[PDB]
Amino acid sequence: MVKCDPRHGKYMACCLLYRGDVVPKDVNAAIATIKTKRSIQFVDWCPTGFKVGINYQPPTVVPGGDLAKVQRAVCMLSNTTAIAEAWARLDHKFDLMYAKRAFVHWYVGEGMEEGEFSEAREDMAALEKDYEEVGVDSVEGEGEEEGEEY
Amino acid sequence: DRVQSKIGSLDNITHVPGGGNKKIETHKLTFRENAKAKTDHGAEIVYK
Which residue, A79, A73, A74, is CA-closest to A14? A79
CB-based contact A55:A21 (threshold 8 Å): no
d(CA A50, CA A11): 10
Task: Assess whether the previous peptide bond of A135 is cis (omega < 30° from 0).
Answer: no
Domains and CATH numbers, chain A: 1-82 (3.30.1330.20), 83-140 (1.10.287.600)
Within 13 Å, how many C-alpha atoms sit on residue A140's CB side? 1
Tell me which method was used to determine the 3D structure: cryo-EM
Q: Does A105 touch chain B (CB under 8 A)?
A: no
Q: Is A18 exposed, middle or buried (0-12, 13-18, 19+ CB in 10 A)?
A: buried
A100 and B CB contact within 8 Å: yes
| Cα distances (angstroms) measured from residue A39 to each of A8, A42, A141, B15, B16 | 11, 9, 21, 75, 73
User: CB under 8 Å to A3, separation ≥6 — which residues?
Assistant: A86
Q: What pairing do the DSSP bridges indicate for beta strands A11-20 and A54-55? A: parallel
A-chain CB neighbours of B25 within 8 Å are: 100
Contact between chains at A99 and B25 (C-beta distance less than 8 A) = no
Resolution in angstroms comes to 4.1
Contacts of A101 in chain B (CB under 8 A): 26-27
Query: In this structure, are strands A72-80 and A54-55 parallel, antiparallel, or unpaired?
Result: unpaired
A126 near B CB under 8 A: no
The phi, psi pair for A4, rounded to 5°, reads: -55, 125
Give the residue on B whose Cα is nearest the Cα of A102: B26
Measure B27 CA to nearest chain A CA, in Å. 6
What residue type is assigned to position A2 of the chain? V
CA A10 vs. chain centroid, Å, equals: 8
A73 DSSP β-pair partners = A19
